Enzyme design. Structure first.
Site: not given
Ligand SMILES: Nc1ncnc2c1ncn2[C@@H]1O[C@H](COP(=O)(O)OP(=O)(O)O)[C@@H](O)[C@H]1O
Ligand SMILES: [Mg+2]
Ligand SMILES: Nc1ncnc2c1ncn2[C@@H]1O[C@H](COP(=O)(O)OP(=O)(O)O)[C@@H](O)[C@H]1O
Ligand code: SF4
Ligand code: SF4
Ligand SMILES: [Mg+2]
Lengths: 276, 276
Positions: B15, B129
């Site tokens: 996200k 979630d």
């Molecule tokens: N398209 C992508 N390619 C590589 N890594 C990604 C990609 N999207 C997310 N990540 C990695 O996945 C992890 C979680 O993403 P994040 O946006 O923090 O998730 P959320 O906010 O849904 O909990 C981070 O370490 C981020 O660098």
């Molecule tokens: Mg987040």
């Protein structure tokens, strides 16, 4: 005596697969176990019951009238190895507190005598992405003395482990809820075992087992079974047997030391997870 | 006019990475955007601000006395491309409702005039979630008219998309909250794009973009930047530009059709995800 254990972790990390396989291994050993599903997904017992899922206490109470109109003998269902299974359920999305059904379910089981002397273990399978409402109740109200957190080298999974640990610390002044260990459910990344060992050391616990990623899990689950039942000779079956043995033998139950986000990031950097 | 958009999805699905990169691309285009972090992890703005994270409204109100003692000009922070950023915060684990800070934050922003005419977009980055408390408030109280759900071929991520869709349906009798699309954040699995397209079709929406998995994301985030700012020529930068363009141009906003677990499992089986 019986040991009351809860399996926490972020969504999709492997709580229900790990719990049901660990419990199948315990039953294979001759232990009497009950699984209490505390996740609204409500599929925490399907591999024991050979089932799509299990109808929840919330659903059954609504059809019966009140939870008082429910009989324990109508609610608990036994599957592989005699393992007893129940699902809490919870309100639909956007309706009231997602964890409300956990409170109803655990109180019902307690009142109706589900915690019979003959049980050796109870495992609660608990949603861990938020630590509040009914999802905090096993910790807040001293229902699960041994918390095992399933995680992986994924930053979000380690963050969740740290958050759950903060909840344990918050309630340490009463009751006896303790962190029993981390279970690494592998994402097949390099040094992941070392990473979770290091995280556990910082929290003051241990990594009780490294569960490999193995497609036999998917093949067993398509057939609604644990790996233990599906293929007792599978390497992954022996992994779950090793996890179960270490849980049985575990005596380290601590009040954990939650870490900063700086420390989490440092762990990630150290073990080169952030790997091609 | 301004378009109020919310990005939902299970924890760790992408996200915050997707939102901040999409928003950077919007700012690169000349749009004025504000990001409102609605996840207790509270790192939803760090790539815009070049920062560790951002101090939250809950934290700042506690140091000031009341939320009324806070000034908007002290709370909102501007980073890359002039994008304005705020974090809700929330109670510590095991203390009260994890989403309570979202309610406080959104009401504060509304009362203090943060929704100035000149804004083109507001993006809420919301924990998905559970769909309750403050996390349901953007849907329940009609704050985000366009919901985009980040998911992947992972069963848990598709389950979360379905749960969020059920919350949208629950509140469709008032307000105008609608499902705008699914964003597939790739796990690098075969037919994953086809799978999320099929899921979107069943829900009645679309898969607005397939975001590839690309390590440039990790390299940019180590340096506290979006890919847009870190390497404007990166292929992944153009992916986020394509996502932003399609969001700008999107006119399909529906009341979704949530599916059964049987249908979800059928999708998984069809597209051979459950692949070596
Ligand atoms: N398209 C992508 N390619 C590589 N890594 C990604 C990609 N999207 C997310 N990540 C990695 O996945 C992890 C979680 O993403 P994040 O946006 O923090 O998730 P959320 O906010 O849904 O909990 C981070 O370490 C981020 O660098
Ligand atoms: Mg987040
Ligand atoms: N060790 C493993 N090897 C292969 N697949 C696994 C393993 N552990 C879990 N899975 C798979 O990951 C998915 C999520 O696991 P599950 O236990 O349902 O997560 P949770 O209960 O934490 O949401 C399931 O499809 C399951 O088959
Ligand atoms: S987070 Fe769900 S109701 Fe408080
Ligand atoms: S789920 Fe968090 S407080 Fe209701
Ligand atoms: Mg589960």
């Amino acid at each position: 005596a019986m040991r009351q254990c809860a399996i926490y972790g972020k969504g999709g990390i492997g709580k229900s697969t790990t719990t049901q396989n660990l419990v199948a291994a315990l039953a294979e050993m001759g232990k009497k176990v009950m699984i209490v599903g505390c996740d609204p997904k409500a599929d925490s017992t399907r591999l024991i019951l050979h089932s799509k899922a299990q109808n929840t206490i919330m659903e059954m109470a609504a059809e019966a009238g009140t939870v008082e109109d429910l009989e324990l003998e109508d609610v608990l269902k036994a599957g592989y190895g005699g393992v007893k299974c129940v699902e809490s359920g919870g309100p639909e999305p956007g309706v009231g507190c997602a964890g409300r059904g956990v409170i109803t379910a655990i109180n019902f089981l307690e009142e109706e005598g589900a915690y019979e002397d003959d049980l050796d273990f109870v495992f609660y399978d608990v949603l861990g992405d938020v630590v509040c409402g009914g999802f905090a109740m096993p910790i807040r109200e001293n229902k699960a003395q041994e918390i095992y957190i399933v995680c992986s080298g994924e930053m979000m999974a380690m963050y969740a482990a740290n958050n759950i640990s903060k909840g344990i610390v918050k309630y340490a002044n009463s009751g006896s809820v303790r962190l029993g260990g981390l279970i690494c459910n592998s994402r097949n990344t390099d040094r992941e075992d070392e990473l979770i060992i290091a995280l556990a050391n910082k929290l003051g616990t241990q990594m009780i087992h490294f569960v490999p990623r193995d497609n036999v899990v998917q093949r067993a689950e398509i057939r609604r079974m644990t790996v233990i039942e599906y293929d007792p000779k599978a390497k992954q079956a022996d992994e779950y047997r090793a996890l179960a043995r270490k849980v049985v033998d575990n005596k380290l139950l601590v009040i954990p030391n939650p870490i900063t986000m700086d420390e989490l990031e440092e762990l990630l950097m150290e073990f080169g997870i952030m790997v091609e």
